[PDB]
From Swiss-Prot:
GO terms for biological process: DNA topological change. Residues 1-109 form the Toprim domain. InterPro entries: Topo_IA, Topo_IA_2, Topo_IA_AS, Topo_IA_cen, Topo_IA_cen_sub1, Topo_IA_cen_sub2, Topo_IA_cen_sub3, Topo_IA_core_domain. A zinc finger (C4-type) spans 539-560. The record marks H30, R134, R135, D138, Y143, W150, R284, R455 as: Interaction with DNA. It comes from Thermotoga maritima (strain ATCC 43589 / DSM 3109 / JCM 10099 / NBRC 100826 / MSB8). Residues 158-163 are annotated as: Interaction with DNA. This is DNA topoisomerase 1.
Amino acid sequence: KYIVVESPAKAKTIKSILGNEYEVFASMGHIIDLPKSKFGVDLEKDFEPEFAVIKGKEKVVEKLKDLAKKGELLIASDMDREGEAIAWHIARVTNTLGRKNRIVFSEITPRVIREAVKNPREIDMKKVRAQLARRILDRIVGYSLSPVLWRNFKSNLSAGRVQSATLKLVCDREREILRFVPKKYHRITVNFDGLTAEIDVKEKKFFDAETLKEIQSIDELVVEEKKVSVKKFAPPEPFKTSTLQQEAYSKLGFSVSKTMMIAQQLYEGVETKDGHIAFITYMRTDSTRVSDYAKEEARNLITEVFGEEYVGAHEAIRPTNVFMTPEEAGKYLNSDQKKLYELIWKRFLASQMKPSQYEETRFVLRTKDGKYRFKGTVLKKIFDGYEKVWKTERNTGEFPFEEGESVKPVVVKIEEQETKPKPRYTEGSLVKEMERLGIGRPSTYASTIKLLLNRGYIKKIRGYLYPTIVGSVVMDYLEKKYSDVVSVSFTAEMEKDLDEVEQGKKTDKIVLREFYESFSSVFDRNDRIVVDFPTNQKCSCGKEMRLSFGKYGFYLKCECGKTRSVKNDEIAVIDDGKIFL
């Protein structure tokens, strides 16, 4: 009996579980792939893919074949569509496709793996076709456009439409910021007994000087309205991929790629010397679902540690063993691993606890002349519930006053302010937006972001993401020549379609034929352009500068001064055909 995995870390963990019952073999990654050099898809035979053994993996292939002749060869790749395709490759080279030989699991624990190896299944060809269709789409786009982008801008669109749609989100945000016109207004607050209230106005306003003098003179208010109601706050959901990446960015400072690397370590298992042990469930998931087993262990822990009054195919990202507390975990985990584990643990435990309960007092105060009103709220905690674990500070206090009572002293604070544009994306907030719009999936949020940064299409400055000269220019070309095909809308629609292919609810060939019609109608292989944009930069002679591109890359020029060179990753946005540096 042989078990095949992709990584040496997974092999160790599974071997720790099963011992001598099974022989465990690691492929050291992929064995078979589309031709590295050639296009590798036959457009004349309904998008038929061409596969070749990866150079350097031939010995691996031969060993797989040998093992499959010696006993049953179970395949324990990860459960996503990429893993399913790895499993399909192994089955095909070994001539075992159709046998119940594929093992399915969300965690690498004694309990789950021991059961999983006794219940193998047939490879899921729906999942395989979804994956192969993604590979084919990216290959059609990549091999068509990357030469055209090399010819014109010395660049390329490898990670296909998902990369281009995410780049577009960043450029779209940058234009929103560029076009924003701030408005001056006053923030007016009244303060009394640890409470605050804001002036009640229909919209933000810059008040005239005499009005400000009048308002600043207020030293007494009357309670006009007080409404008290019970407010419950729901606990957070257990993590999925997108939410882990967001929160680990905002709470720990981890780039999304670092979060996925640490999370892989904790899912695959780490070497301790109580053997090789796993800490979390699989890290590529769109689900916040929790197993009955996990729910019950969490109830038991909560009941015991906090009290029973605190008790509230893909799975959430959660600890495998809730009794492996963060404190316990530090004997085994490095500092970064322990931070992520702790985050995951608290999120999951909190998700299983009661909503918190507060009394909210909503109040209105007025001047005695009836000219001005101020509104505020205050909360009083009744029950902390999940907040004992998912630490939360709210605006708490006391409102002892009743309707009609005068309040004195009151202190007024008037502050000149200016409206602000939407913030730029951070890695975490870009992932939020990709999920919101159906762009990218658990396997591709982090690698898409990493790729955009690595190619210089976007640049990070103090955690914020900016489009660049080459990012802006490439995006503009794609929009001009491939409008519909590279839209956020068409990219999200394709992702939905691949998910239906996965579920057996649409056909891969229909999806591909339909895409290829759309693409091939607009695709122009010989397109030769001259980069030439007006800009927001001026020469000292007075003339405006224009952006050009030559053998030494991008430069600025005018019809009287000297030419300034510009780097590919200088920050830039194109709006209405003009490049803003």
